[PDB]
Design an enzyme around this catalytic site. Sequence first.
Site, PDB file in Angstrom:
ATOM      1  CB  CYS A  16       2.371   0.862   7.505  1.00 52.27           C
ATOM      2  SG  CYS A  16       0.740   1.523   7.942  1.00 52.27           S
TER       3      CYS A  16
ATOM      4  N   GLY B 106       2.290   5.896  10.285  1.00 57.23           N
ATOM      5  CA  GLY B 106       3.695   5.734   9.930  1.00 57.23           C
ATOM      6  C   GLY B 106       4.348   4.487  10.512  1.00 57.23           C
TER       7      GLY B 106
ATOM      8  CG  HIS C 233      -0.575   0.173   2.520  1.00 59.22           C
ATOM      9  ND1 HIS C 233      -0.185   1.406   3.030  1.00 59.22           N
ATOM     10  CD2 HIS C 233      -0.523  -0.739   3.517  1.00 59.22           C
ATOM     11  CE1 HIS C 233       0.141   1.190   4.296  1.00 59.22           C
ATOM     12  NE2 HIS C 233      -0.044  -0.083   4.637  1.00 59.22           N
TER      13      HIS C 233
END
Lengths: 298, 302
Positions: free
Chosen positions: A138, A136, A41
């Site tokens: 991820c 942030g 993503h």
Amino acid sequence: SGFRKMAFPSGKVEGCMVQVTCGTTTLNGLWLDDVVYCPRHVINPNYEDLLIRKSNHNFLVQAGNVQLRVIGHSMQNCVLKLKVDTANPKTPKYKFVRIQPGQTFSVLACYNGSPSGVYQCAMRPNFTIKGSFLNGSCGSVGFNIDYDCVSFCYMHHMELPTGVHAGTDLEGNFYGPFVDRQTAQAAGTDTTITVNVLAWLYAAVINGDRWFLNRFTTTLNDFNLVAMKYNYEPLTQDHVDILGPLSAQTGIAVLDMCASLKELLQNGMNGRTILGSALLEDEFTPFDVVRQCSGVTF
Amino acid sequence: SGFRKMAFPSGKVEGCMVQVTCGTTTLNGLWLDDVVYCPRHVICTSEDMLNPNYEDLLIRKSNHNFLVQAGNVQLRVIGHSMQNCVLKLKVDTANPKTPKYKFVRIQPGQTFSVLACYNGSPSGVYQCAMRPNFTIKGSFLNGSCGSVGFNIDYDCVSFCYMHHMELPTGVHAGTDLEGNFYGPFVDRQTAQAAGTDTTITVNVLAWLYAAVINGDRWFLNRFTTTLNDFNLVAMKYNYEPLTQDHVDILGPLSAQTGIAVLDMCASLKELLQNGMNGRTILGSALLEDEFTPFDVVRQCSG
Ligand SMILES: O=C(N[C@@H](C(=O)Nc1cncc2ccccc12)c1cccc(Cl)c1)[C@@H]1CC[C@H](C(=O)N2CCCC2)O1
Ligand SMILES: [Cl-]
């Protein structure tokens, strides 16, 4: 003495954390050998269509204060693999492993490729993790250590509306019925990890807490009838076998401990605590208990 | 979202752990630059732990009596000195993995991460708080002595604790990195007991503000309290007195949530009176006191 929620030493994983920037999005990547792994993503999305438009130079990878040059890119399920020109000199001995619900792992939470904290957690039976993550985070990873080998088992992708987290194994397969897209998704009804509660009760006995013990024993069928009523996961013969060493060390048979657990479910703790907790703890596996009560090192 | 007991990444500390052996005793040491720090009780004998004279035991030692091992490499001891209850072993090699560091002495209520070690090898990392009675509720076995407590705010490691002993109640006592014990403890096997422990009030309040930040408001009420009335109530539940310094420290959390410190104090008084009534706050059925106001801001905001 003592019993803490303990994570594995994170040093071997810290040396693998990098920052991946694509467009306006910045997240964390895992640099192993000459490949950086991160959530796909970072690029209703058609990931093949989005990826074909990106060139190697569109991905900015930063390892500390050094920019790594991306020389290739490919997608495997929900993970993006960025081929870089430099092999990570800090790459530890590693494996990619997929875990089962109830298994525990350590999470090295990161922001901008920089590790901020380490905590221990369990893969819930509903395939979510009760983590502690902000925007942030991820690309932050979950792992276990076996002697000197790091087994990577989780990569963070998203937060569900209830505050719980969803992610994949390192091959990009999600844990749970989740998809990497901004859409209506909800965690299923969660259950308590029974084998882990029993392991935690044995840890309390090893630490001198015996008030919940009783003279009674039960059958596996009778206990599962009770456990199903309290949203507890069924206890299998495999779980009973796994708890064998703890049963032999404390002198309390697994079904003898089940009768303690049934009494705690039907009557509560009555103002008392077990290992400093008023709730039955389910994020310590039988192996975690043996490792901490014996001091295994890495 | 979420609220976990979070430890600092331990890598910078792992690269400093060594094994120190003197005679039959093996424990952990902290290798920073060309010095290895460890508990001085590594020089003790089985028959002399009640009343050891460390100056007398140390004068009889030579550098080669101390075996220091960093991984599979034996370090050469070229000097030794004692500073309070810590032994400092000068070695012939500076640790190439020495991070940016400071030695800091902490106050009760402060939290830190512990890297538990055995034979110079790290086994686990957990989060801890210095109890008001100066003990820590750790998880340590025999051979864990020399394991260290630290904080890693920014890129600098602040070492604040070194493990020395377990008291009879299962709690732990140790020193700062200058060898001064926290609490009225001594490194002797003489009868010692931790004082009556109390709850760290400022930390419980910080954790109640963390619950408000993550969407939990069930415990708030329409009341307020004076600081003195709150303290009169808190003392009856074995809670530490809340000072004006604590009220000032909670200011940022109060401004962020819109709940005055003395209003959060009234909510805590009610929780102490009523209990939780089958409910939880941030996944806990007890009031948590091992998150400081600083920890709450770091984990909830960055
Ligand atoms: O209890 C011992 N050591 C210390 C201690 O408290 N160690 C431990 C720390 N944390 C958790 C523990 C859990 C279970 C058992 C031990 C633990 C200790 C005791 C008293 C005073 C001081 Cl300063 C240190 C045993 C018995 C003597 C031996 C030892 O340290 N020797 C030195 C020289 C001759 C052998 O190790
Ligand atoms: Cl402090």
